[PDB]
Structures are given as structure tokens and as C-alpha cells.
């Protein structure tokens with residue numbers, strides 16, 4: 001139940017690319033074909049072991065707010081890392097990454113870590129975004145790149161682990177200490193506290 | 195393809211609308227929530243410093259001048275309309291039941307101060323402070339104590355704890371008389387505890403005053419210091435949080451989406467939908483703020499001046515508090531209404547390091563609104579910049595039953611959000627036909 005560091009992660013990207021399925025595959029190890037949920041995923045908590053350190057990840061999902069690009073600015077508050085997802089079968093979803101990058105520049109801290117994920121790599125016949133083009137783009141925008149499949153699990157754990165490592169290894173000691181369990185008391189009030 | 199049909203359309207993302215949208219989504223309703231504006235929060239949004247210049251200044255300064263004086267825009271989340279949360283108020287109750295606490299963090303406000311004869315005094319938040327305060331002499335304090343002991347001991351259920359008083363049949367002045375309280379004590383209880391902005395309550399049934407005073411005492415009792423909480427990153431976090439609750443439970447959001455046309459059932463004037471650049475959307479009812487249906491609203495006859503002041507130092511005579519309320523009771527200035535100041539700072543992530551935001555407000559009663567605020571400006575010490583706005587207060591002409599157009603009230607001059615949650619509860623009852631019942635989110 002105790003942990004070394006706690007990081008806040010976000011998922012972002014166009015509707016339909018598989019963000020919620022990616023999070024459920026990572027958190028619950030489940031995949032539902034033609035996934036549709038009445039109540040959207042809020043966030044999931046998963047503790048991972050990282051170079052002998054216990055890292056608690058609170059990973060936030062969009063609750064569908066991306067559909068018409070209405071992500072609440074509060075979504076980015078206190079984020080350490082952001083995973084930008086597109087769909088390898090959908091060129092527009094890839095083109096949309098440039099816009100999400102601009103949003104991240106606007107609302108997230110200048111030091112936030114970013115990762116590019118091309119999801120649905122199981123759909124080999126329907127791929128249209130070429131790996132080398134996506135990789136060169138990720139390079140040009142300061143982020144690593146993985147292609148994943150929530151459906152068959154390809155690279156899913158590795159995507160979240162890649163991000164947790166980008167953060168833990170990039171962070172100044174001041175920033176890293178503030179994520180420790182001892183430093184979890186931020187001086188805020190617990191409204192559910194008697 | 196976008197679904198045409200919804201249970202409810204909501205217009206504007208002010209906090210009243212966002213709470214309703216969240217509650218109705220939680221109830222299982224299919225909600226479409228649209229704003230003409232390119233951001234959340236409606237009239238009670240928190241905005242950046244550049245936006246503050248755009249809104250309230252004639253010639254906005256350059257990015258370079260702004261940043262050299264005030265730092266980065268990202269550090270600034272400035273409330274357009276000041277409000278605190280009562281710690282035991284209804285908004286806290288809603289936050290806890292819906293778990294919107296997951297999306298918004300809160301800090302205590304350091305204290306509430308009352309103005310008397312040119313000086314400010316911290317209103318007691320504990321027994322030691324009550325013993326210490328020069329606001330009352332010893333014998334008046336003893337009479338005050340018996341009054342507050344009655345507040346604490348009164349059980350509606352049990353007539354033996356009423357001390358011959360009836361909360362519905364007796365006026366608040368008559369309640370004060372039973373305890374022999376003088377005019378200065380009446381002003382203190384009425385304005386600093388019940389938080390009335392005027393003395394109308396003296397000749398009205400005691401019940402609402404009794405409940406407000408109990409609410410104040412329960413709120414200061416929750417965590418000490420003061421009766422108030424304030425959200426980290428500003429009031430704009432609240433509507434954003436309730437919008438997220440709605441989205442989780444199935445709500446659909448559109449911003450920067452003008453309402454081209456409101457649609458009505460022919461020859462009836464009743465709501466059926468809206469036309470937008472994205473298509474035509476239908477629902478049996480709409481919930482909206484006054485800016486979407488100005489013809490269906492009326493002025494309350496009050497205008498509120500709100501002066502957003504940026505300081506580069508703490509407010510004098512507040513023990514360098516990171517946040518506070520100041521109350522200037524009407525009798526101290528020969529006014530008809532109190533003047534409030536709401537002060538927050540870098541401790542609440544609303545401005546860059548070293549700055550304070552002091553937002554002064556009151557209902558205008560003279561022909562020179564800026565001059566009315568002078569006694570409050572004088573309490574602040576040197577002021578770096580002022581951004582001045584005046585808002586007319588609106589309310590719906592009708593309750594919405596006739597036309598299924600359920601409108602909220604403009605955010606009022608009160609210093610906290612209780613009247614806003616009163617409006618939510620009233621609108622919800624109007625919309626659903628039954629009082630709101632909160633369940634604990636699972």
C-alpha cells in the first residue's frame with residue numbers, strides 16, 4: 001500500500017483511437033470488442049515496480065471530452081506525463097497530434113513529459129500511417145514513440161512503463177521529492193474528513 | 195454523425211449549469227451541454243492576466259511588458275466573480291456526494307475581518323479569540339454567549355429548548371430582545387455571522403437568520419480559522435469539475451458553439467431544440483443562464499461593481515494572511531449594503547509569486563460607483579493594477595414550467611456560494627418535480 005513516487009499521467013488524442021481501451025488493458029487486463037461504456041473511465045490507479053522503486057500511477061482518461069475538443073483545462077493541472085494516442089489506420093488521428101501538442105504547450109507545465117502512441121497495430125491490412133513517418137514526427141516533437149494494440153496487448157504495458165521512466169528519470173530532485181508519500185500532504189482540506 | 199435527441203440541453207458552463215448537468219447525468223439523463231464561449235465557466239470563470247486586460251482595459255499591454263511585471267500567464271487564474279465556500283455549506287455536501295472532490299482541491303481561508311471605524315478586526319474563530327476580541331465589552335459578551343448557547347441547544351423537535359421563542363412567529367429583532375443584545379451586537383451577528391448585506395432581516399421571521407448563524411458556527415467549527423474554503427487554481431475549477439462529472443456519466447460537451455437559433459413548438463413558445471454550426475439538437479427541456487434568453491429574464495434592479503486589484507504585498511493589518519474576507523458593514527459607511535473584499539494569493543495558485551488578488555464588491559448605491567469603493571481601496575495599501583467591471587443582476591421572469599426553459603440567476607453580491615446552491619436545488623425541483631436527493635457516488 002506504501003509507494004516511492006506518485007505520478008499523475010494523462011491520456012489524450014482524438015476520439016476513437018482507443019485511449020479508454022488502452023487504460024483498461026493496462027489497469028484491469030481486459031479488452032472488450034467494440035467497446036462502448038455508459039459510464040466512462042475516470043481514472044485508474046496502478047502501482048508498478050521501476051528500477052527497484054515502487055511507482056504509483058494515477059492515470060486519467062478523457063471521459064469523452066475530446067470529441068469536440070472540450071477538454072477541461074483542469075484536466076492538465078498537476079500532470080507529470082501525457083500519452084498522446086492516434087490510430088495507425090486513421091491518418092486524420094495522426095494529423096490531430098499536432099493540435100494536441102499545441103494544447104499541451106498551452107495548459108501543461110513546460111517540463112511535462114510526452115509520449116506518442118500509434119494504437120490498433122493489430123489492424124495490419126488497414127494501416128495507413130507509416131512507422132518511419134510517425135517516428136520522424138515524434139523525433140521532431142521531442143517524444144518517444146510506440147505502436148500498440150489494446151486488443152492483443154502489443155506494447156501496452158511497455159507504453160505506460162516508458163512514460164513512468166521518462167518522468168522519474170527527467171525530474172529534478174526538488175520535483176521528484178514532491179511526488180514521495182511523505183510529501184503527499186499538500187496542506188489542502190479533506191472534505192470527507194471528520 | 196451526431197445524435198439529434200437528448201433528455202436535456204444545457205446552455206452556458208457557469209457553475210449552476212455545470213452542477214445541474216452533472217446531477218442530471220448522474221440521474222441517468224442524456225445531456226448535451228453547449229457554450230458559445232471558447233472556455234468553461236460562464237460569468238464566474240477564472241481568467242488569465244492577458245484576458246483580464248482584454249476584458250477591462252482599453253489598450254492591453256504587450257506580452258513582454260506583462261511578463262516582466264507579472265510573470266507567465268499560466269500562473270494567473272483570476273476569478274471574475276468572488277465567492278468563498280462555507281465549510282458546512284450545501285456545495286461542500288454536493289462535492290462530497292459526487293466525488294467532484296477528485297477534480298478540485300481546497301484550502302482554508304485564513305480569516306474573516308470586520309471593519310469598524312476605519313480599522314479591521316479578525317472575527318473570532320475559536321473561544322480564545324472570542325475571549326480576546328475588543329469587538330464587545332464583557333457584559334455584552336455574556337449576553338452574546340447566552341444567545342449562541344441557545345443557537346446550539348435549540349432542537350426543532352423539542353419545544354423545551356426554545357426559550358419561549360418561535361422561529362417562524364418571532365422576528366430576528368425579537369430574538370435579539372429576548373437576549374438583551376444592543377445595536378452594535380445585532381450588527382455583528384447579522385453582518386459578520388448571518389452575513390446579511392443589509393438590515394432587512396431584523397423585521398423578518400427569525401428562522402433564516404437562525405439557520406445562517408448555525409451554518410456559520412458549524413462551518414467555522416469544521417476546520418477552525420474561518421468559515422470558508424477556496425479552490426486551488428480558482429473558482430473556474432468548480433464548473434470544470436462538474437462538467438467532467440457530467441461527461442463521465444454520459445454528457446456531451448461543445449464549446450465555441452454559438453446558438454444560431456432556438457427552436458420552439460409552433461404557436462406555443464415552448465422549447466424543442468437548438469440549431470448550431472454542428473447541426474440541430476432536440477430535447478424536451480433546456481437549462482440555461484440569462485445570456486442565452488435575455489428576453490425571458492428581468493433585472494433584479496441591482497448592479498454590482500467588482501474591482502479586481504493586483505497587489506505585490508499582503509493586505510495591511512491581517513497578520514500577512516494568505517487569504518481573507520473583509521466585511522465593511524453598511525452602518526460603518528452610512529450605506530444601504532455591505533462592501534466585501536475577497537483576498538487570495540499565490541497560496542491558492544491564482545497569481546504569480548508575491549502577488550495578491552483583492553476583489554472588492556458591493557451593490558452600487560451612488561452615481562459614482564468607483565468612489566463608493568474608496569474606503570475598501572484604502573485598506574489595501576499600494577495597488578499595482580485595478581480591473582473594474584460592473585454587472586447587472588438578472589433573474590428569470592418565470593420558473594420554466596410553462597415553456598421548459600429553466601433559467602438560472604446571475605451570480606449575486608453575496609460573499610459565498612450558498613445562494614448559488616439554493617438556485618441549483620430550486621431549478622432541480624422545477625425540472626424534476628421532486629427535491630434533490632444526493633446519493634453517495636459509488
Ligand SMILES: Nc1nc2c(ncn2[C@@H]2O[C@H](COP(=O)(O)OP(=O)(O)O)[C@@H](O)[C@H]2O)c(=O)[nH]1
Nearest residue numbers: 015016017018019020021034035120149150151
Ligand atoms: N482493432 C482494435 N480496436 C481497438 C483497439 N483499441 C480500441 N479499439 C476499438 O476502438 C474503439 C474505440 O475505443 P475507445 O477505447 O473507446 O477509444 P477512445 O475514444 O480513444 O477512448 C472501440 O470499438 C474499441 O473496441 C485496438 O488496439 N485494436
Ligand SMILES: C/C=C(\C)CC/C=C(\C)CC/C=C(\C)CCC=C(C)C
Nearest residue numbers: 318319320324327329330411414415
Ligand atoms: C462545537 C464547537 C464549539 C462550541 C467551539 C467553536 C466555536 C464556534 C464555532 C463559535 C465562533 C464564535 C463566534 C464567531 C462569536 C464571536 C464572538 C465575539 C465577537 C466575542
Ligand SMILES: C/C=C(\C)CC/C=C(\C)CC/C=C(\C)CCC=C(C)C
Nearest residue numbers: 324335336338339342343345346411
Ligand atoms: C455549534 C456552535 C455554536 C452555536 C457556537 C457556540 C459558541 C459559544 C456559546 C461561545 C461564545 C463565546 C463568546 C461570545 C465569548 C465569551 C467570552 C466572555 C464573556 C469573556
Ligand SMILES: [Mg+2]
Nearest residue numbers: 019020063064
Ligand atoms: Mg474514451
